[PDB]
Structures are given as structure tokens and as C-alpha cells.
């Protein structure tokens, strides 16, 4: 096996990205098939990864995770100061 | 009609809880991720492969060359430079 099958075949993650007038959507999708317990793994490990990016380069990075089939990122055009 | 417990993965730090390790060395800033040696293998290689394409998108953004270091260990470690591209 490839790997996990998330519905762009084995192994593969394929986000969708997006350009909005405050800054980029970065969309993670396929995710309603995963078992409970790491779907709750994948968003704190992704929350926390982007929070040490964030707060090393001066980005306030934000992830929306409403529970569902997809995670998406957002990446602010600017810096917060 | 069946559903099994949704507690939380421990990998150290608590229940559901996912803490990094920050030190400073060549050029950058890296991250480790600790105490993944009990996660199932399939569902860590799909959160290296969903770190890589994040940082990829992040360094590409921002440039910077964000990168990250899969030894398939009980570990995942990003590096984030310094200075930029």
C-alpha cells in the first residue's frame, strides 16, 4: 500500500489554494474518512506547527477546523506588525 | 451503531496534546516533534506529507526555505531559517 487513501489516490494530499483580499486559503480536504482519534491528532499537530511558524517569522497564521471533511489554513498577505 | 472511545492520543505531554521541542543551530530555528513511535505508521506518514505541503506553501509565500526532516522514527523535525531564499 501506498498509503492512506484520502480520495486523490494512495499516499497522495493534495490541498486546494486560494488568493482572497486578506490573504491565502490553503485547503485540505478527503479528511471525513479518518479515524477519530487522529483526525483530532492531524489538527493539533497542524495548529501547532503553524503557531512556531507564526511565531517565528511574525505571520498570524490561523487554521479552521469545523469538525468536518477538510482543514484549511490561512496565510495573512502581511506581517501583524 | 458502533463508536469506539475518542480521548486522545498521548504521545507524552497528556491526552490529545502535541507539544514541540524549539532549538537554534545552523541557520535556523528547528522544531521537533516528539513521542510519535506509538502513532500508526500510516496515519504518520500522512501528517508528514500534509507538514510538507503546508511548509511548501508557507516558504513559498513568505520565502523562506522551510523544510522538513522524516527519519520514519518516532519523530518529525521542521527546520525554518533564519534569513530568507
Not at 1 to 27: A, C, K, Q, W
Amino acid at each position: 500500500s501506498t498509503g492512506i487513501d484520502l480520495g486523490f489516490g494512495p499516499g497522495i494530499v493534495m490541498p486546494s489554494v486560494s488568493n482572497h483580499e486578506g490573504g491565502t486559503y490553503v485547503r485540505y480536504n478527503g479528511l471525513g474518512n479518518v479515524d477519530p482519534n487522529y483526525k483530532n491528532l492531524i489538527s493539533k499537530m497542524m495548529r501547532s506547527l503553524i503557531g512556531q511558524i507564526g511565531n517565528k517569522y511574525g505571520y498570524d497564521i490561523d487554521l479552521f477546523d469545523y469538525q468536518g471533511d477538510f482543514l484549511e489554513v490561512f496565510l495573512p498577505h502581511k506581517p501583524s506588525k
